[PDB]
Each structure stands twice: as structure tokens, then as C-alpha cells.
């Protein structure tokens, strides 16, 4: 609610290009920790804090948001590897820019855009990151968008945003970070 950058209130002029290195690391999907109940304490806290949704409403919102079969993503300064249903796919990426999206509430967010240079990248040819930041800084978590047509197609996806935290965290530590 407060008008901060990470709540989506920022000046256009402060939005600056990033590089894939901001996202380098070994990352894990948070979805298993929603599914196993670890985040129930998060949804209970959020409901009691904001009053915007009940616990069940929050769980449904985050179920839609977090669902993915991409269980792990490993990122270097120039590559991304997606582990998805018994297969690993790794491609080399270039930065292709950024996009400011305006949400219905009136706040905004920035997606940082990457394109695979490999010819056979398929649904991983176009990849975008959202992490509540608008300019270079090491990512602490991210929400990903990916597909095989264009960056612009992905700007239409607002309700599913598979979400990733560092592999060295337990689900309990991820819950702690979400409560903070
Ligand atoms: Mg996991
Ligand atoms: Na800036
Ligand atoms: Na999936
Ligand atoms: Na998952
Ligand atoms: Na591979
Ligand atoms: Na927009
Ligand atoms: Na972002
Ligand atoms: Zn986030
Ligand atoms: Zn978010």
C-alpha cells in the first residue's frame, strides 16, 4: 500500500537496463512448498495483516500464480537451464530490454527481457524476469515468464508467474522471507 519502488510506485526515469548476471544462481520453484502446506502460515499472516483476502482466497491466488512443472532453474551470466518433467534444457541468452507494465490497481512493475540465441529453444526462446526491482541489483527471488512467440505475447500473462528462490534455502526459510 505504501508508495515504494518494490510496491510498484517508481519514476520512469529510474528504470534502468539490467544483465542476466543479476539473476545468476541455482534456483528452485516455490510451488512444492505451497502444495505441502509450508506456506499456509504465510497465507494466514497475509489475511490477518491486509484483510484483502481470507487464507483460502490467498492460497487459491498463489496456487494459480506459482503452479509450474519447471522445478529448478540454473542461471549463469549468459545461460539458463530449465529442469522440467524429466528433461533439462540449457540455452545461451542475450538481453533485449525492459518493459514497464501498468497494473489495474494503478501501480506498475518492470519485466527484464532475454532471448535465447540457440535456434532450438522452443518455449524458452523468450524469457522475462520480475523481481520488484527496476534497475541493477542482485536478485533475491524472481517471477518468470517464458514462451516461444515473442516478448510481447508474455506481457499478456498476469496471473501465472512461477516463482523461484535460492536452492540453499529450505521451504521454511522461503516462508520466513515471504513473511518479512
Ligand atoms: Mg523447490
Ligand atoms: Na535507477
Ligand atoms: Na509448467
Ligand atoms: Na514447481
Ligand atoms: Na541441455
Ligand atoms: Na501496461
Ligand atoms: Na523486475
Ligand atoms: Zn516477488
Ligand atoms: Zn510479484
Coordinates of C-alpha atoms and ligand atoms in Angstrom, one line a residue:
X1 CA 0.0 0.0 0.0
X2 CA 2.8 2.4 0.8
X3 CA 4.2 4.2 -2.3
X4 CA 7.6 2.4 -2.5
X5 CA 9.5 1.1 -5.5
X6 CA 9.0 -2.6 -4.6
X7 CA 5.3 -1.9 -4.2
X8 CA 5.3 -0.7 -7.8
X9 CA 5.5 3.1 -7.3
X10 CA 8.5 4.5 -9.1
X11 CA 9.6 7.1 -11.6
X12 CA 10.1 6.1 -15.2
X13 CA 13.5 7.7 -15.3
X14 CA 14.8 5.3 -12.6
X15 CA 14.1 2.2 -14.7
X16 CA 17.5 1.1 -16.0
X17 CA 18.7 -1.9 -18.0
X18 CA 20.0 -5.0 -16.3
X19 CA 22.0 -8.0 -17.2
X20 CA 21.4 -11.7 -16.8
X21 CA 24.2 -11.7 -14.1
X22 CA 21.7 -10.1 -11.7
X23 CA 19.8 -13.4 -11.8
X24 CA 22.8 -15.8 -11.7
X25 CA 22.5 -18.7 -9.2
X26 CA 20.8 -22.0 -8.7
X27 CA 17.1 -21.5 -8.1
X28 CA 14.1 -23.6 -7.0
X29 CA 10.4 -23.4 -7.6
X30 CA 8.4 -22.4 -4.6
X31 CA 5.3 -24.4 -5.7
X32 CA 6.1 -27.6 -3.8
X33 CA 6.0 -25.6 -0.5
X34 CA 2.6 -24.2 -1.3
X35 CA 1.5 -27.8 -2.1
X36 CA 2.9 -29.3 1.1
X37 CA 1.3 -26.7 3.4
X38 CA 4.5 -24.8 4.3
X39 CA 3.0 -21.6 3.0
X40 CA -0.3 -21.9 4.9
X41 CA 1.4 -19.8 7.7
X42 CA 2.2 -17.2 5.1
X43 CA -1.4 -17.0 3.8
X44 CA -2.7 -16.9 7.4
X45 CA -0.4 -14.0 8.1
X46 CA -1.3 -12.1 4.9
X47 CA -5.0 -12.5 5.5
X48 CA -4.7 -11.2 9.1
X49 CA -2.4 -8.4 8.0
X50 CA -4.1 -6.9 4.9
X51 CA -7.7 -8.1 5.3
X52 CA -7.8 -8.2 1.5
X53 CA -8.4 -11.9 1.2
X54 CA -9.1 -14.9 3.5
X55 CA -6.5 -17.5 3.9
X56 CA -8.2 -19.8 1.4
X57 CA -8.6 -16.9 -1.1
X58 CA -4.8 -16.2 -0.8
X59 CA -4.0 -19.8 -1.2
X60 CA -6.1 -20.0 -4.4
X61 CA -4.4 -16.8 -5.7
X62 CA -0.9 -18.2 -5.1
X63 CA -1.8 -21.7 -6.4
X64 CA -2.7 -20.0 -9.7
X65 CA 0.4 -17.8 -9.5
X66 CA 3.0 -20.4 -8.5
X67 CA 2.0 -23.5 -10.5
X68 CA 4.7 -24.8 -12.8
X69 CA 6.5 -28.0 -13.8
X70 CA 9.8 -26.1 -14.1
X71 CA 11.2 -27.3 -10.7
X72 CA 14.7 -25.7 -10.9
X73 CA 16.3 -23.0 -13.0
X74 CA 20.1 -22.6 -13.1
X75 CA 21.4 -19.2 -14.4
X76 CA 24.9 -18.0 -15.3
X77 CA 25.9 -14.7 -16.7
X78 CA 25.0 -16.0 -20.2
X79 CA 22.9 -19.2 -19.9
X80 CA 19.7 -20.5 -18.3
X81 CA 18.9 -24.2 -17.7
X82 CA 15.3 -25.2 -17.1
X83 CA 14.6 -28.5 -15.4
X84 CA 11.0 -29.6 -16.4
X85 CA 9.4 -33.0 -16.2
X86 CA 12.3 -35.4 -16.7
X87 CA 14.3 -33.1 -19.0
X88 CA 16.9 -30.4 -18.7
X89 CA 17.2 -27.7 -21.4
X90 CA 20.0 -25.2 -21.4
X91 CA 20.4 -22.2 -23.7
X92 CA 22.5 -19.1 -24.1
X93 CA 20.7 -15.7 -23.8
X94 CA 21.1 -12.1 -24.7
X95 CA 19.5 -9.1 -23.0
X96 CA 16.9 -7.5 -25.2
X97 CA 15.5 -4.7 -23.0
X98 CA 12.8 -4.0 -20.4
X99 CA 9.0 -3.2 -20.3
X100 CA 7.1 -1.2 -17.8
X101 CA 3.6 -2.7 -17.2
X102 CA 0.8 -0.8 -15.5
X103 CA -1.5 -2.9 -13.3
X104 CA -5.2 -2.4 -12.9
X105 CA -4.6 -1.0 -9.4
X106 CA -2.5 1.8 -10.9
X107 CA 0.9 0.7 -9.7
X108 CA 3.4 -0.7 -12.1
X109 CA 6.2 -3.3 -12.5
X110 CA 9.1 -3.9 -14.8
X111 CA 10.0 -7.0 -16.7
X112 CA 13.6 -7.6 -17.9
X113 CA 13.7 -9.4 -21.2
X114 CA 16.0 -12.0 -22.6
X115 CA 16.1 -14.0 -25.8
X116 CA 17.9 -17.3 -26.5
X117 CA 20.4 -17.3 -29.3
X118 CA 20.0 -21.0 -29.9
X119 CA 17.8 -21.9 -32.8
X120 CA 16.0 -24.8 -30.9
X121 CA 14.9 -23.0 -27.8
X122 CA 11.2 -23.7 -28.2
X123 CA 9.1 -22.4 -25.4
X124 CA 12.2 -21.0 -23.7
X125 CA 13.2 -18.7 -26.6
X126 CA 11.7 -15.6 -24.8
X127 CA 12.2 -15.2 -21.1
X128 CA 11.3 -12.4 -18.7
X129 CA 12.1 -11.7 -15.0
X130 CA 10.1 -9.7 -12.5
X131 CA 11.5 -9.2 -9.0
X132 CA 10.0 -5.9 -7.8
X133 CA 13.2 -4.0 -8.8
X134 CA 13.6 -1.6 -11.7
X135 CA 17.4 -1.3 -12.1
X136 CA 20.6 -3.3 -11.5
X137 CA 20.8 -5.2 -8.2
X138 CA 21.3 -8.9 -7.4
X139 CA 18.0 -10.7 -7.4
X140 CA 16.8 -12.3 -4.2
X141 CA 13.9 -14.1 -5.9
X142 CA 12.1 -13.8 -9.2
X143 CA 8.9 -14.4 -11.0
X144 CA 9.4 -15.8 -14.6
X145 CA 7.6 -15.7 -17.9
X146 CA 8.6 -17.7 -20.9
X147 CA 7.3 -18.7 -24.3
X148 CA 8.2 -19.3 -28.0
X149 CA 6.5 -16.4 -29.9
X150 CA 7.7 -13.0 -28.6
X151 CA 8.3 -10.9 -25.6
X152 CA 5.0 -9.1 -26.3
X153 CA 2.9 -12.3 -26.0
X154 CA 4.2 -12.7 -22.5
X155 CA 3.1 -9.2 -21.5
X156 CA -0.5 -10.6 -21.5
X157 CA 0.2 -13.2 -18.8
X158 CA -0.7 -11.7 -15.4
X159 CA -2.0 -14.5 -13.3
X160 CA 0.6 -17.3 -13.5
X161 CA 4.2 -16.3 -12.5
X162 CA 6.3 -19.3 -11.5
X163 CA 8.5 -18.1 -8.6
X164 CA 12.0 -19.0 -7.7
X165 CA 14.2 -18.7 -4.6
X166 CA 17.8 -19.8 -4.0
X167 CA 18.4 -23.5 -3.8
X168 CA 20.2 -23.2 -0.5
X169 CA 17.0 -22.2 1.3
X170 CA 14.6 -24.6 3.0
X171 CA 10.9 -24.1 2.3
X172 CA 10.7 -22.8 5.9
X173 CA 13.3 -20.1 5.1
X174 CA 11.4 -19.1 2.0
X175 CA 8.2 -18.8 4.1
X176 CA 10.2 -16.5 6.5
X177 CA 11.3 -14.3 3.6
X178 CA 7.7 -14.1 2.4
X179 CA 6.5 -13.1 5.9
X180 CA 9.2 -10.3 6.0
Ligands
LIG1 MG1 11.6 -26.4 -4.5
LIG2 NA1 17.8 3.7 -11.1
LIG3 NA1 5.0 -25.9 -16.4
LIG4 NA1 7.2 -26.5 -9.3
LIG5 NA1 20.5 -29.3 -22.0
LIG6 NA1 0.8 -1.9 -19.3
LIG7 NA1 11.5 -6.6 -12.0
LIG8 ZN1 8.0 -11.3 -5.6
LIG9 ZN1 5.3 -10.2 -7.5

